[PDB]
């Protein structure tokens, strides 16, 4: 078979969320649901209840908290082939936070780096949410899409996301800024000898 699952579901606390695993001939087959909190092993699963329309199986969470936030996978078993099939996965986001703004910090090369004949610019982004940013570098007001390294937004202990970006260039190009976008609201920095 093949189970189709919605990529993402967003729900505010104290509400009710439904996740829909969709397949065919899900008649006598029973779908199992798995909860996987980030960085942990998944566990099989009084608010959690399940259903099966024969073509659609649904996992329902009534009165959502924060500890309910996770990836949820559904799975069955094709008797005919003997193969276990899993869903695509759903990132359940529980909107328990208010908009915020990134804190960009740009640092120059440590001189010694030039002594080793390199140039690396670090742009540090912290305390931002929702969790995506479109970083873009620039050399003297001109775009730079060459030697850019960025990361996946990562959750802090304090529940906000943080990311960093490094610009890998040469000292030659150095004495010869940082622009971070978040929901339109672009934040800038400075680069100078």
């Amino acid at each position: 078979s093949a189970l189709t699952q919605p990529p993402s579901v967003s729900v505010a606390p104290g509400q009710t969320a439904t996740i829909t695993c969709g397949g065919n001939n899900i008649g006598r087959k029973r779908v199992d649901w798995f909860q996987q909190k980030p960085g942990q092993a998944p566990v099989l699963v009084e608010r959690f209840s399940d259903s099966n329309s024969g073509t659609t199986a649904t996992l329902t969470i009534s009165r959502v908290e924060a500890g309910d936030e996770a990836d949820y996978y559904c799975q069955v078993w094709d008797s005919d082939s003997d193969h276990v099939v899993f869903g695509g996965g759903t990132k359940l986001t529980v909107l328990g936070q208010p908009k915020a703004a990134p804190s960009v910090t740009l640092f120059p090369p440590s001189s010694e780096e030039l002594q080793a004949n390199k140039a690396t610019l670090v742009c540090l982004i912290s305390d931002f949410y929702p969790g995506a940013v479109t970083v873009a570098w620039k050399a003297d007001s001109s775009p730079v899409k060459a030697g850019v390294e960025t990361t996946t937004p990562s959750k802090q202990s304090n529940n906000k996301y943080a990311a960093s970006s490094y610009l890998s260039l040469t000292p030659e190009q150095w004495k010869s800024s940082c622009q971070v976008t978040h929901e339109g609201s672009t934040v800038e920095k400075t680069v100078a000898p």
């Binding site: 092993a41 003997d82 193969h83 276990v84 440590s110 690396t120 390294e149 990361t151 970006s165």
Partner: protein
């Protein structure tokens, strides 16, 4: 009680043969199927197959056939799963799970996977071990240290040997197109904190036995 305890993380070079173990305790080992499933970095779950500890019969997923082999020991109640010629696209976390969840009827006779192992993180890379290259960053005021080019991504940064713990923020690492990791850690201080005390960053990178202490001054 009932649990499966897996082996420790693996970092191996391609062409190697990673074998992961899964110890079964808390129940009669020979009673239940044990499945293996893998999870690619930040992706979903993909079934690899199952093995019966009793008979030793196995069943591998179509995609996972001829290169992966599942085994059982019994004498010590442990199932193994082996990639004999591992590749870079094999980097993922591997879970074993027990099928102990009872069945409803005869229309769907399949034991559900209730107790899962802790997972074993296997990283396959042709990159070799490299000690870090720490650089000091000049500057509320922000300080910090930039640690570049190192492998693997297992390391730790502290400040003035455990002193500074307040305004410290250590960022996660980036994986570059070279296969080497990089990170930076920064401290936010009151704007006149440099003159009173000079700060020092401490970097511990166990896989290369490298420890560096770097003084940070403008």
């Amino acid at each position: 009680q009932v649990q499966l305890v897996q082996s420790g993380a693996e970092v191996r070079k391609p062409g190697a043969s990673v074998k992961v173990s899964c110890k079964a305790s808390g129940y009669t080992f020979t009673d239940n199927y044990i499945h293996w499933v893998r999870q690619a970095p930040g992706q979903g779950l993909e079934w690899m197959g199952w093995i019966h500890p009793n008979s030793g019969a196995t069943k591998y997923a179509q995609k996972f056939e001829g290169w992966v082999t599942m085994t059982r020991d019994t004498s010590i109640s442990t199932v193994y799963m082996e990639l004999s010629r591992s590749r870079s696209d094999d980097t993922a976390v591997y879970y074993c799970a027990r099928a102990g969840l009872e069945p409803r009827s005869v229309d769907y006779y399949f034991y559900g996977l209730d107790v899962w192992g802790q997972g074993t993180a296997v990283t396959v890379s042709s990159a070799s071990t490299k000690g870090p290259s720490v650089f000091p960053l000049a500057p509320t005021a922000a300080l910090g240290c930039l640690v570049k080019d190192y492998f693997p991504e297992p390391v730790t940064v502290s400040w003035n040997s455990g002193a500074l713990t307040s305004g410290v923020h250590t960022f996660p690492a980036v994986l570059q197109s070279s296969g080497l990791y990089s990170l930076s850690s920064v401290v936010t201080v009151p704007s006149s904190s440099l003159g009173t005390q000079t700060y020092i960053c401490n970097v511990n990178h166990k896989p290369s036995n490298t420890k560096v202490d770097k003084r940070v001054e403008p």
